[PDB]
Each structure stands twice: as C-alpha cells, then as structure tokens.
Amino acid sequence: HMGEFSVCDSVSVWVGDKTTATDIKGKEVTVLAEVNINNSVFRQYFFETKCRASNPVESGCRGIDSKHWNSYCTTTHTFVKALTTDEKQAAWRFIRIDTACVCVLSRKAT
Amino acid sequence: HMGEFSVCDSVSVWVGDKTTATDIKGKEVTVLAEVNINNSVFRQYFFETKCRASNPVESGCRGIDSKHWNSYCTTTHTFVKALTTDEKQAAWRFIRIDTACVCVLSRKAT
Amino acid sequence: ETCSTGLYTHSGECCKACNLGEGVAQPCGADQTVCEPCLDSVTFSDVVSATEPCKPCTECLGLQSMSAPCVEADDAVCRCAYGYYQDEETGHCEACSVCEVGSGLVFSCQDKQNTVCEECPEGTYSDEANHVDPCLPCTVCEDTERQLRECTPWADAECEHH
Amino acid sequence: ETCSTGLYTHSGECCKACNLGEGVAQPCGADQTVCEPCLDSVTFSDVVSATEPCKPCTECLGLQSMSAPCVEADDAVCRCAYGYYQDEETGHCEACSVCEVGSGLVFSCQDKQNTVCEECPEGTYSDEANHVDPCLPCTVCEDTERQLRECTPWADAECE
Question: B58, B89, C55, C120: which has the fewest C-beta neighbours closer than 10 Å?
Fold first, then answer.
C-alpha cells in the first residue's frame, strides 16, 4: 500500500459491544455482551469493516471509468460462529458481520 | 437489472479442512481438523474468499479509468477466534482468514 | 396445563419437549423426557419435540458444496458447486453456461439460476467466453489518432498515433 | 531430568511450569505447582512459568482503541484511535494531519506513521483537506463544451 489507493475507503474496528446480528439463515437475532456469569465479563469480539461512504466521488467509486460505468461502494459480509439467543433458547449460530467495502459497476445506455 | 458487476471477481467457499493459518500477532500457526477426541469429528469451519485473479482485465481491475490509473485486485483479510496449536501448547487465537477481494489504484506519472 | 407436546408421561403429566440443539435421549415413558445437547458438526435438533433426537448433519458431496455449516440449532445446507446451478428439471447440478464471445454477462450463475448472457449491444464487445466478464465499451481512438481495427461485437477497436 | 523451570519442589523434584492460558494457582512448595486456565477477556498467561499467574487483560482507554482482544494465550493489544498515530517523541496519541487542498494523500495515517501528503502534481487536484482522498486527475473537456475554469492544483476544470 505504497502510494496506492483504495477505490472504496473503508473503516475497520473491533466490536466487543455487539448485541444484535442476523442469522446466516437470515433470521434476526441477538448476541451476548456483559454476561457477568461467574463474576467475569467474557465478551465476544468481532472485526467489522464498513464504508466511509457510498460515493467517495461524485461519480461513485474512486477512479472507475465514470464515462461508461456508474459505480457505488457497498459493504461485504462474511459469517462467524458466535453465541446468539433466539428468545428463550440461546445457542451458537453464524452471523453475517461486515468485513469489507467493495465497488460495484453497471453500464450506461446509449 | 443487477446487472451489476464486481470490479474484482471473487470466489468464496466453506473451509472445514483448514490446518494452517497466521496468528493475528503475525505468528504462523496450525489449526485442528479431524480431532477424533470422543469418537466425534468436531471441526472448525471458516468462510474464505479470494480473487479469481490479480488482473481480471489487461488493464487490471474491471472498469477503472485505465488511462490514469493502474489497478490490481488483492485479497482482504479479517480475523477469527479459532482453536490453534503453537507446538506443544494449543489455545484459542485469532487467525487472518481471507474474506474479500478488492481493487487497489495507483496513478500514472507525466 | 395444556400439553404442547401431545405425549404424556405414564403418571399422566405432560412430556418435556426437546428444543433446538437438544434431541431426545430417553423418551418420557416411566419418567420425563431426558434431553441432551447435540454434537456440533455432527448432529442437530432443528426442532422442539419430545420425540425427535439429534439427527445427523447433512453431508455435502460431489457437486454439493456447502453454503451453511451444520450446528446443533440448524442443519447444514449444501448448494451447487461454484461452476453450476441447480436444474429445476434435472434435480441435478448442471454447469453454468458461458457468455460466448460477442456476448457478455448479465446476471450471474446463482444457486437456482443459470448464467444470463446478452448479445453485446451497439458499442460493446466480448474478449472471451466465460460466465464472469460482461460486455465492455469500445475504445474510441481520436479524430487525430489513426484507426486500424474498427470495433466489432466481438473485438475492441485498435489504434496508434504519431 | 533437567529442570526447565529452575524451581524445585521441596522433595527435590522439578517444578511444573504453567503454560499459556495457565497461570500459577498454588506454587510448588510442599507439592507440585497447581495450574488453572485463565479467565477469558479478563486474564491471560502469555508465558510458561511455574511462578507467574494469570495477569489482568490490558484495558484500552481514551485514545487507546483495541487492535487485538485479550485471550488466555495472549494479552489484548491497544493502538491509536482511528484518527491518530503513536508519536515517537510524545509517547502520546496525536491526530493524523490532513492533506489540505492542493494536496492529496500518499500513505495513510497508520499506528506509528502520520499522514503523508503530496503536493498535487501537474494535472491533478484536491477537492478538500482530509487524510483520505488522494490527488485526482483533471477533467479534459472536449471540442464542444467550451472550457470555462482551467484545472488548478486545487480545483478541477469545468466545462459543458
């Protein structure tokens, strides 16, 4: 990364305070946080990444051929096994956490 | 009309057979697989994503302004808590698993 | 005390169902049901029954590539391998047809959906035939730069100057 | 039977070290060492000693944002917050200098490295001043679209 530049700027961060997520199945669900079971704090961390913004330029993504393509940066998910809770029952499930930001083209008509 | 196209093509897959990885600290390390402790198979799955290729076009990424920018798609890492083994001792550590493929610009001089 | 299960212990009482991740260990005959958590990657109770035990994790083989892994709560789901899609009339994994030269990608080859190509319209072209590239716009030279190859539905234009 | 630890039980024997994720519970005095796994997110034995117990997980505060979480095997590592970098001469988290107009990004503001800007060279420009945008190439108009504003090291050209 040397004088090299992303096309979608992205900001990644460690997310200990995560309390909601979406079942891989697609089923909204909740996570655990404080969980002061045993005088401890436990905690589940995740490494989330999202977009600085949709259109880092007026044209869209940074440095596409704005003349033929429209572009827009979106966020890409990935899945993690982590501890969830669907109502009364709480088990391990896979949650769709954000993980990168990548640009998506579409052509122009004429 | 999505009808929309990536700029770096990518291929994601579920990786049950994973036996090596890299400590978040940066420390090469090994994972578990069969682990037939208890007549079971256990297993650790991960969702890896990597690049169809560096240059999905002769110019580099798909649909950049090839006239002012050189481009090349690379793979993006993210971290997971999973069970590793550093020599005799084997504990939980964070491993840098591939998770997406994104294009990287650099300008041209003149 | 409505029994949800529909099964009753011999004593008359209502039977304890086994929730998700819990399958039946010993049925509620003499006594209540005994539930035990499922083995990961191996078994799963994706139901709340006082009858059903931990079923065996669906395995993926051949063109069955995995989409969702198997967990106590839910079974693993397989889908067609990278190359292919599920055929609604063959129940079998057939491979994504490619977008031949002079043609490009429009919608990709999803689980149930074959590649959808398109004849490269006025001003576009296809280098090759795959299920990845779409139609690209043609170079335009310059009113200055001499024009050698003109742009065809199947190959870009070519040029050079002084 | 070389003792690795350097400590010996009273009986003369060699003392059991506590590996990673295991800290000392009761030292090898009368008997051997008693090891217990560390608490997650709380303690950690990042060493193999028959002496050392489960140390407390480094906490992050103020401009300490977390980079690596704390686990039994290894302590959590903090680093400068999104905005800032660690100053080699202040030991304190100072904020990334931005790339002012007429200037663009070159290397970003990393953990130990401040923003590295560049004067927008011939043919480029900077809309704003931030530590994110680099120099962009200038529009070039055409035969039609009369040229109005020419391109300056600080603002794109304009036409139509």
Answer: B58
Separation between Cα atoms, residue D44 and residue D57, nearest integer Å: 7
Point out which residues pair with C41 in neighbouring strands: none
Bridge partners for B84 per DSSP? B31
> Dihedral (C-alpha) D19, D25, D29, D33: value to the nearest 10 degrees?
-30
Contacts of D51 (CB under 8 A, 6+ apart): D7, D24, D27
| Residue B45 is labelled as binding a ligand | yes
> Cα(B6)–Cα(B23) distance, rounded to whole angstroms?
30
Please give the interface size between A and D, counted as residue pairs whose CB atoms are below 8 Å apart: 36
Domain C1-81, architecture per CATH: Ribbon (2.10)
Tell me the Cα Rg of chain C: 29
The one-letter amino acid code at D106 reads V
User: Domain containing A67 — which CATH number?
Assistant: 2.10.90.10
**Residue that has been written with the tokens 């199947």 in this structure:** C154
Give the closest of C65, C69, C133 to B45, CB-based: C69
Length of chain D measured in residues: 160
Question: How do the domains of chain C map onto residue ranges?
Answer: 1-81, 82-162
